[PDB]
Design a binder for this molecule. Structure first.
Ligand code: ZN
Ligand code: ZN
Lengths: 131, 118, 204, 37, 122, 59
RNA sequence: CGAUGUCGGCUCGUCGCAUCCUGGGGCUGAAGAAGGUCCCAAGGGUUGGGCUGUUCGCCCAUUAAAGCGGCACGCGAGCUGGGUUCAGAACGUCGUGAGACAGUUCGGUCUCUAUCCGCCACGGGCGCAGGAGGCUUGAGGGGGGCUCUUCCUAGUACGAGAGGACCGGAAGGGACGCACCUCUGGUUUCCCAGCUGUCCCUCCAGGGGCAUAAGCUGGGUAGCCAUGUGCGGAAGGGAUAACCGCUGAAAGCAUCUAAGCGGGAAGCCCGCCCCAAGAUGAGGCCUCCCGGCAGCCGGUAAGGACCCGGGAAGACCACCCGGUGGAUGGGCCGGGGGUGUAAGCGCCGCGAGGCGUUGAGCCGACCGGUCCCAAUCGUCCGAGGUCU
C-alpha cells in the first residue's frame, strides 16, 4: 500500500486542472463563485499572489489587495470548484516563494519591488497563439 | 516526542555536530577504515555516502559542493580520483559499518568501525 | 452490528456541495472473518477479522492451525467485531455507504511520558513575577493533614495517548469499492498507517 | 404544600392523613395543603 | 479573534475612531470575538463633535478581523485591521454609512443594513 | 524545596529487596565460525578478526 | 514553644447542601410572561475586568447563574511574599528619655537530591496444577454528564390591550472533553536563500569557521501543536425523590396506602467511551506440542528469549515490527515539498551589477522502488502434564 498514492487516487476525482500556472508576485483576478442569499453570483478578487503553499491537491494560495485603503488578504483552495477561473493581469517578478513583507509597504514600494517578468510575459505573448 | 524526526543529536549542538561529521568524513577518506562509537558511525553513513555520490557525479559543481564540507583540495582530489571511480558502478551504500567486539575501556563505549565498501 | 478493520492512510479535505469537507482516508477491506464468536461457543456474538495478510514464513504453528481451522490465508492482524455476524466471509467497505454514521476506534499517537500540562491542560505557573522553577508544575496536589493523602485518579504526568481511543458519530463521506478505501469526515485517532477499527455508530 | 413541623387543621375541611409515614393536612383549600417536615 | 482590551476601528461616521472591546455578547464566557460578533466596547477616540464621544459604552459588530476567517467553501479572508460598527441595541448600524470592505457573514447574521451600506462586502 | 530527608533507616531486608533487580545478565556470546571462539553476536571476532565469513579487522 | 510556617494571590482540586442556574414539583394575593415562597434535587456550571496586599466589598460589562461553605480560616518539602512581623528610615502621636504603636509610610535572603505511605505512569518475579500463540468476555473501576439563543408551532392559547404562552419539534451557539493536522496559523538547530564583519581555503571567483548554546534576516516539509478541523454531552430502559395518582379497607363516607398498582427529575443504575481475570473467584474460545532416575532428570515440541535493523512505541524497561525468503533501517532512485533561477559559461554594462543558460541548483523527516550497505553467523530457555 502506497498511502500517498492512495491519497493521489482519491484526490484525482476532484483535481481541477485548467487553471493558469502562476507564481508569487503575479497579480490575478479570481473568478470565484459566491453564494449570496439564495442566488450564487461570481465576484472577482484581484491582487498579488503573496503566497503559494504546495500540498498537491491541497495546494493553496493567497491574494492581497488594498480595498479602500484596507489590505484584504484572501486565500483560495487551488482546486476549489468555486474558483471559476484565474486571470493573470500581471506577471510580477518577485524573488521569494513567500511575499509577506508587502503587508507593510506603500503601494509605490510594492510596484517597485515587484517588476514584470519579461520572460514569462514574453512567453504568454508567445503563447495565446492558436492555429 | 521524537516522532519521525530523523538524525541523531549525538549530544552536541548544531555546529559541533556538523564539524564532527566533516572531520569524521575527512578521516574516513584519509584512511578508508576508522573506529568510532556506533551512533556516530550510523549518523556517518549518509553523510559519507552523499559525498561519495557527488564524487560519482564528478563535475565542477560537485567539486565545490563536496568541497563545501571537506574543505580540502588534495583530499577532494583523492576523492574524485580514486574514490569516485571505484564506486562508479555502485548505487548507494558506499560504506559499511561493523560493530567491534570490545567496548571502550575508558567508558564502556560500544565501538564500531566504518569502512568504504570494497 | 456492522464494522470493519481498517488502516489510517491519511487525511484530506474534499469538495462536496461547495464544502471542503476534511476527511481521513482509511484502507479498510478486504477483511476475511476467521472465527465467529458465537454464544454457544463463546457466550456472545462476534467475528474475528484478518487484516492485513502476513508472510506464511512469519507465522507460528498455533496461528497457522488457527487459519487451517479457518480457511483464510495467514494474515498479520486479527481482531473481533463485537455483535457482528456477517453473512459474507470477507467483510469489505460495501457494508457501509457514504453518509452513514460510524464510530472509529484506534490507538492515539503515543506521546510518551507526557508532562502534566500537555496531559491534562493544567495551567502550570506564571512565567515571571518570581515563579521559582515551577513554570510547568501542577502546584498543590492535595490538602493538609485532612485527609493528608492523595486521592486516586489525581491527574499527573504519564503516558498521554498510545491508547485505544474511539471517536464516535463520524460520517462516511464516501466509500471506495475498487480500492477498499473509505472516506470519513473529521479526524481519526492514531498515526498514518496505524491500524484502526471502523464500526457503526451506537448513536441514534 | 406548606411544609412545617406543627401541621394542624385550619378549617373543618382540613382532613389529616398519615400518608407514607408522614402527616398531611389535606383539604379543599390548596393553601391548606400541608406536609409535616 | 477579538478579545477584551482590543482596539477596533469604527468603520462608519458615528464620530468615534477607535474603541476598546470590553466584553463579547456571545454567551456568558465566550473567549473571543470574530466576524459578525456583537461586542460591547468603549469609545477611546472620537472625532470632535461626533454622534458619540469618548467613554461611550456601545454595542458594536465586528466587521473586519486581522485574524484570518475560514468559510465552508474552504476559502479564507483576512483584513489588515480590526474594524467594528457602532450599532444600537437592535443590531442596527448607528452610524449612517460604513467604510472599507466587510465580511459576508454579516448577511449570515442578519446584518443586511451593514452589508448594503458596506462599500465592498466580501 | 525544603530538603527532603530519609525518615528512617532502611532495613537490611528492604535494601536487599530493592537490590533484587540489579542482577547482571551474562553477556551473550557465540562461537566464532572462523576460529570457534566465543564472542558477542553481530561483531567481528577479535580472535579471528573476521566477520560474515570474511576478513575485516587486521588482527 | 529540642518549631504544627499564620493573611493574600496562583495551581490543583475533593466534598457538603443550608441549591445561585440548569432538572422536577406545591401553593399563590399564579389570567399569560415574568414572579414570590416552599418541597425533591449536588450531574454539570457557576465569566472577564477596575480599586485595594487584601479575603470582603463597591463598581464596569455580561451571564442561566455570576451559591454558601469544609477540607490546618485546603493547599510554601507546589509558587509568590503584596500585607503581617526582624534588623534600616520617616511621619502623627505617647514618653523627660531610651523607645512605643496596630496608626501610617519606603526597603528588606523563602532552604537543588523524596526513605516510607499516598498518587501518576512503566516494568521485573511468581502465580493463574501441562507448556505455548492469539483472540476475547467482563467482576468491578474510571471519564463523561452542561447550558444558552433563534425559529416553527404561534403571535397560537391566555390576555382589554399590553404582552404573551404549554407542550412538541428544528437550527445555531458558548464553555468544556477527546482526537487529529486535510485547511489557517505557529515552531520547524542548518532544509533553502540573502546579507555584514573577520580570518582562512586560493589571487579572482566560488566556499568554510566565527559572530549563540542558528551571526542576522526572508521562508519552510515533516513531526508537535491551537488559535484549525472533526467528534461528544446521547436516545432509550429500569427503579426512583418531591409531587400527582387509580383501586381501597381499616373507618358504611371518604382516604395515593394500610393490601396492590401507575406516573413521575440535569437526580441513581444501565445504556456511551476507556481499564480491567493479581476478578489468587487468576475467567472463556480458538489453534499448536508430545523419553530416562504428585515426584525426578533429559534434551526437547510448540514457543520464547538473548542478539541485531529499527519504529508517530519509548526515560529504561516495555509494546510493535523486521532478520537473506528480508525492503527494517542507512544509501541510491523517483515523486511530494521547500527554497527560489545554482555554479560555469556566454552577452551587455567603466562598475556596482543585469540577461540567458534556468523553475535552475540544493534539498530533514514525507510517499514508494531498488538488496548497494547491514539486521552475519548463532546460543540459550523451554513440554513427558497433581491427584479424587
Ligand atoms: Zn382546610
Ligand atoms: Zn574469530
Amino acid at each position: 500500500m502506497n498511502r500517498g498514492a492512495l491519497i493521489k487516487l482519491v484526490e484525482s476525482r476532484y483535481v481541477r486542472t485548467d487553471l493558469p500556472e502562476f507564481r508569487p508576485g503575479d497579480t490575478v483576478r479570481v473568478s470565484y463563485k459566491v453564494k449570496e442569499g439564495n442566488r450564487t453570483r461570481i465576484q472577482d478578487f484581484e491582487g498579488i499572489v503573496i503566497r503559494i503553499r504546495r500540498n498537491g491537491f491541497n495546494t493553496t494560495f493567497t491574494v492581497r489587495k488594498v480595498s479602500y485603503g484596507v489590505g484584504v488578504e484572501r486565500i483560495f483552495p487551488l482546486h476549489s470548484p468555486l474558483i471559476q477561473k484565474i486571470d493573470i493581469v500581471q506577471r510580477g517578478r518577485a524573488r521569494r516563494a513567500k511575499l509577506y513583507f508587502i503587508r507593510n509597504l506603500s503601494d509605490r514600494e510594492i510596484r517597485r519591488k515587484l517588476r514584470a517578468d519579461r520572460k514569462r510575459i514574453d512567453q504568454d505573448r508567445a503563447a495565446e497563439r492558436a492555429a | 516526542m521524537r516522532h519521525l524526526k530523523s538524525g541523531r543529536k549525538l549530544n552536541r549542538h548544531s555546529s559541533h555536530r556538523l564539524a564532527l561529521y566533516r572531520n569524521q568524513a575527512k578521516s574516513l577518506l584519509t584512511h578508508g577504515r576508522i573506529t568510532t562509537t556506533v551512533p556516530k558511525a550510523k549518523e556517518l553513513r549518509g553523510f559519507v555516502d552523499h559525498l561519495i555520490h557527488l564524487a560519482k557525479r564528478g563535475d565542477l559543481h560537485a567539486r565545490r559542493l563536496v568541497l563545501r564540507d571537506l574543505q580540502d583540495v588534495k583530499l577532494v582530489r583523492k576523492l574524485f580520483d580514486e574514490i569516485a571511480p571505484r564506486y562508479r558502478d555502485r548505487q548507494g551504500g558506499y560504506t559499511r559499518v561493523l560493530k567491534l567486539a570490545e567496548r571502550r575501556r575508558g567508558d564502556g563505549a560500544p565501538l564500531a568501525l566504518v569502512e568504504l565498501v570494497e | 452490528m456492522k464494522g470493519i478493520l481498517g488502516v489510517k492512510v491519511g487525511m484530506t479535505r474534499i469538495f462536496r456541495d461547495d464544502r471542503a469537507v476534511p476527511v481521513t482516508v482509511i484502507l479498510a477491506g478486504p477483511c476475511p472473518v476467521v472465527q465467529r464468536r458465537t454464544p454457544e461457543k463463546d457466550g456472545y456474538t462476534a467475528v474475528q477479522l484478518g487484516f492485513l495478510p502476513q508472510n506464511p514464513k512469519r507465522v507460528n504453528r498455533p496461528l497457522k492451525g488457527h487459519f487451517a481451522k479457518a480457511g483464510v490465508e495467514p494474515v498479520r492482524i486479527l481482531r473481533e467485531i463485537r455483535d457482528f455476524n456477517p453473512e459474507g466471509d470477507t467483510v469489505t467497505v460495501e457494508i457501509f455507504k457514504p453518509g452513514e454514521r460510524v464510530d472509529v476506534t484506534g490507538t492515539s499517537k503515543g506521546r510518551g511520558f507526557a508532562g502534566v500540562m500537555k496531559r491534562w491542560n493544567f495551567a502550570g505557573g506564571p512565567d515571571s513575577h518570581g515563579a521559582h522553577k515551577i513554570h510547568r508544575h501542577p502546584g498543590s496536589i492535595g490538602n493538609r493533614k485532612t485527609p493528608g493523602r492523595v486521592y486516586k485518579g489525581k491527574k499527573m504526568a504519564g503516558h498521554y495517548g498510545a491508547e485505544r481511543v474511539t471517536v464516535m458519530n463520524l460520517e462516511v463521506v464516501d466509500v471506495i469499492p475498487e480500492e477498499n478505501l473509505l472516506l470519513v469526515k473529521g479526524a481519526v485517532p492514531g498515526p498514518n498507517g496505524g491500524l484502526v477499527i471502523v464500526r457503526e455508530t451506537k448513536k441514534a | 404544600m406548606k411544609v412545617r413541623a406543627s401541621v394542624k387543621r385550619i378549617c373543618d375541611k382540613c382532613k389529616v392523613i398519615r400518608r407514607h409515614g408522614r402527616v398531611y393536612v389535606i383539604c379543599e383549600n390548596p393553601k391548606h395543603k400541608q406536609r409535616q417536615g | 479573534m477579538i478579545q477584551p482590551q482590543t482596539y477596533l476601528e469604527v468603520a462608519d461616521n458615528t464620530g468615534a475612531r477607535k474603541i476598546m472591546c470590553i466584553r463579547v455578547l456571545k454567551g456568558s464566557n465566550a473567549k473571543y470575538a470574530t466576524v459578525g460578533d456583537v461586542i460591547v466596547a468603549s469609545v477611546k477616540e472620537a472625532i470632535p463633535r461626533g454622534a458619540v464621544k469618548e467613554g461611550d459604552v456601545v454595542k458594536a459588530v465586528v466587521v473586519r478581523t486581522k485574524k484570518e476567517i475560514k468559510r465552508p467553501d474552504g476559502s479564507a479572508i483576512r483584513f489588515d485591521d480590526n474594524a467594528a460598527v457602532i450599532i444600537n441595541n437592535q443590531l442596527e448600524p448607528r452610524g449612517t454609512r460604513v467604510f472599507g470592505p466587510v465580511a459576508r457573514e454579516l448577511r449570515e447574521k442578519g446584518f443586511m443594513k451593514i452589508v448594503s451600506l458596506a462599500p465592498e462586502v466580501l | 524545596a525544603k530538603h527532603p530527608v530519609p525518615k528512617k533507616k532502611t532495613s537490611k531486608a528492604r535494601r536487599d529487596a530493592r537490590r533484587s533487580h540489579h542482577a547482571l545478565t551474562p553477556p551473550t556470546l557465540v562461537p566464532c565460525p572462523e576460529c570457534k571462539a566465543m564472542k558477542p553476536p553481530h561483531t567481528v571476532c577479535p580472535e579471528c578478526g573476521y566477520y560474515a565469513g570474511r576478513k575485516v579487522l587486521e588482527v
